A paper describes a structure:
Central to these functions, [name] promotes the annealing of complementary single-stranded DNA (ssDNA)8,9 and provides an alternative to BRCA2/RAD51-dependent homologous recombination repair. [name] associates with [name] at the site of ring opening with critical interactions occurring between the [name]-interacting domain of [name] and the winged helix domain of RPA2.
When visualized using cryo-EM, we found that the two species of full-length [name] represent open ([name]-OR, peak 1) and closed ([name]-CR, peak 2) ring forms. The 11-subunit closed rings exhibit features similar to the [name] NTD, whereas the [name] open rings have one or more subunits missing. The structures of [name]-CR (2.9 Å) and [name]-OR (3.2 Å) were determined using cryo-EM. The [name]-OR structures contained a maximum of ten subunits, although open rings with fewer subunits were also observed. The [name] open rings exhibited a high affinity (KD = 0.3 ± 0.1 nM) for 40-nucleotide-long ssDNA but not double-stranded DNA (dsDNA), as measured by fluorescence anisotropy. Importantly, [name] adopts open- and closed-ring configurations, such that the open rings represent the active form of the protein for SSA.
Residue numbers in the entry:
A (entry chain C): 25 to 48, 65 to 162
B (entry chain B): 33 to 45, 68 to 162
C (entry chain A): 77 to 159
D (entry chain D): 25 to 45, 63 to 162
E (entry chain E): 25 to 47, 68 to 162
F (entry chain F): 25 to 49, 66 to 162
G (entry chain G): 25 to 45, 68 to 162
H (entry chain H): 32 to 43, 68 to 162
The structure:
């Protein structure tokens, strides 16, 4: 099953050389496509380990919100990483909208930052 | 086995997304669940309801490959608790399940 | 319903009462139940059951029937995924 | 799976031989260095706990300070841990101060936890 | 697998002889040289800010950390490092110094329990 | 694996005879050295099960500190021992130094006392 | 491993026969069981009370000094210890707890037979 | 194994301990203090006064176990700690006596 | 004497049955005239080698007694013994 | 069969004129050898008793019986 398989030497080396094709910045969907092509559709998973809210203030009618969320990224073999995402949704004037924005931006930023460690190609 | 190449290349290309997933991954080959849910807040200021909820969803395939994402639902202006919590705690699940399947490929 | 309660099974993962109100003079109750449907082929899903009773006489009367309705609705809606 | 397979003699010799070869270590270079030295399938990395110390608000600034614990691990079974400490100052919006502190802490922890496997890192 | 392995007799005696010699970065380097990078591990089981006093502007900090050291055989060791701090006019820096010195001293002390060569 | 394996008969008799003898010539370092030589660097472990600060006070510009500790030795065979060490400090001007001394002497005293249970040699 | 080995019949009978007959108790237990025949641990310890009459402290501590044996049989027993006259609180608690542990170790060990 | 049970069935201060040792063997029975509660303390006229309870427990080789609740008091003493010491020790001994009594006519 | 104890011992065997105490709480004691009353509950328990078990409840009483020790000890013993009698009756 | 008392609470203790009145409610449980189980909370009161001791003795039995007759 996922997280318990092993790769072949030649494909392992091909992937290893692929991941170092370094550029030398947010492209949310494009990172999903890149991962799908470099590890396959059936290659990677990511869970939201935790999600806490730091502050929901109403200073001047305008809201201010802060959400921090830890995300985890795993590859078919069983290796894993983890990083601290963080989304901010200041400015809005409908608590539901600020919560939408922060809670959906923190996860994406975390998935971006947790995927730059498997290689420099991402 | 050969179907692996077919699915991988095909992925490279509303409620209809559920049937789309059933056709693409097989109508017996995709599952989901709700790992957690939290009524975020309820408030009234002018005799009306603003109910929001955050709901996490999970999706896994036949071989165990999985993903997750945050779902969210909102409803404003409704008179009673019944309808507002008929709407938000009802649509957050679908919104999350829509935003989770997009991660598996462009075709979704 | 081709197979019925033999090709698929159900169970409430968790339930919690949302709100109970009496400002109107009668019991206003809202309940939620999470049901999961599992198939013998390994496919499974889950949906948020939900039921409500408005302005009934007693807490138990407004709560038990609302719970039954919520479970029935959750079962009814959880079966969409096999369409 | 990860953390269970054991090296072969030549691999162990190579890695050991490699690892032996006031300003900080520039930060992000360590991820590339470690990835090339152990491999992408080589190691893992996790945050076992993260906790927030004072968030004071003197004279309108914000001084968030966070602490972190970073577990590194090689596929052979070894592991390590260390304590990192983000900081902040001057930022006028708690969103930015929290962001800076929380993000800096984990990188610092990863650096100080990789430094324990040798001098080269 | 780490913890489930047992040293080989010849290497076991070799290490026995090694650790009986007569002599922060130095300690870690020496531990790596003897046991090897694969050889051992290091964990932090608990921590606690003992006191965070504020006398006259300075920030007197104190952190107690229990560091565990372990070897692929299964041997444990634990000790109590205490990282003092003093004189700093900014709270964050004082807490940083204390929390780092704590684990450093803990590792030092917990390693001495193995042999005199440390 | 340590803690799940028994001693070998010849080593058993050697250890038995060695422990029964008596010191010829206690300070902490020598106990550590003798224990190491007696079992090696691989024959045991020591850990702190609990450590509560019994009291900390002040009387005219100083700190009478005191701490407790529950050390615990163990041997490859599974036998174990425990004992309550106890530390003290007087006249120190700074709280940090007093807590330092107390916490540090506690564990070493506990180690000496817990080891002593095995034989007269120590 | 400790807590799972069965006693060899000859050793069982020998220890039983020798059973029908503090530093002293520690040594005797070590010789009768061997250096790896038993273990001892502190299950709980709660300062029963403290006090101060005229600058001299009073202390009291309880200890449930579990003492175990290779075959798996075990005993526990309430200990106790006390101090008086001592002018320093830390010294008082040190003496009290140190004596309580050994008193419990005695009373527990003085149970497997008249030998102890 | 059944022979030991049959022999015990046919058969059924320090004397209770000695009888238990002779009856079950040095490894035949354990005893542990499940809980201890101090029910009062008094300072009437300089003489302390205390009683304690303890849910002593016993076990045999095959796992069959019992339990009970003893009690001991202390009067006429001058030092509190001495009072509690005697109370706890006597309570444990008396509870053990009652637990052993529970097992049969032999005890 | 508590003949029920001996009867159970002879019927099931000394290892055939068991005993336990699950919780005990003094409902009250009062200083009515210096002859304190005492009656204390006790969640007794009993089992058997076959697995079938029966919890129960008991409540002894300490009639007027000038001695606290006698009252408390008598209550604590009587509660357990009466509960044991009750549970044994259920076993049959 | 087996039964247990997993919670219990005396509701009312009362006295009119040297004659006590009391109320209790106990949380009984049951089980069966086949793995199935039954459960029913009960209730019990004692009225017009000479001593509080008798009332407190009686109420627990009445509550336990009320729960058990239903659950069993």
């Amino acid at each position: 099953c996922f997280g318990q398989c092993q790769y072949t030497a030649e494909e392992y080396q091909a992937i290893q050389k692929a991941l170092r094709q370094r550029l030398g910045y947010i492209e949310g969907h494009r990172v999903i496509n890149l991962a799908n092509e470099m590890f396959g559709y059936n290659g990677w998973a990511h869970s939201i380990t935790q999600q806490n809210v730091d502050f929901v203030d109403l200073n001047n009618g305008k809201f201010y919100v802060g959400v921090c969320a830890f995300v985890r990224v795993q590859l078919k073999d069983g290796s894993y990483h983890e990083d601290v995402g963080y989304g901010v949704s200041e400015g809005l004037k409908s608590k539901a909208l600020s919560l939408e924005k922060a809670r959906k931006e923190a996860v994406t930023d975390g998935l971006k930052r947790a995927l730059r460690s498997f290689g420099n190609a991402l």
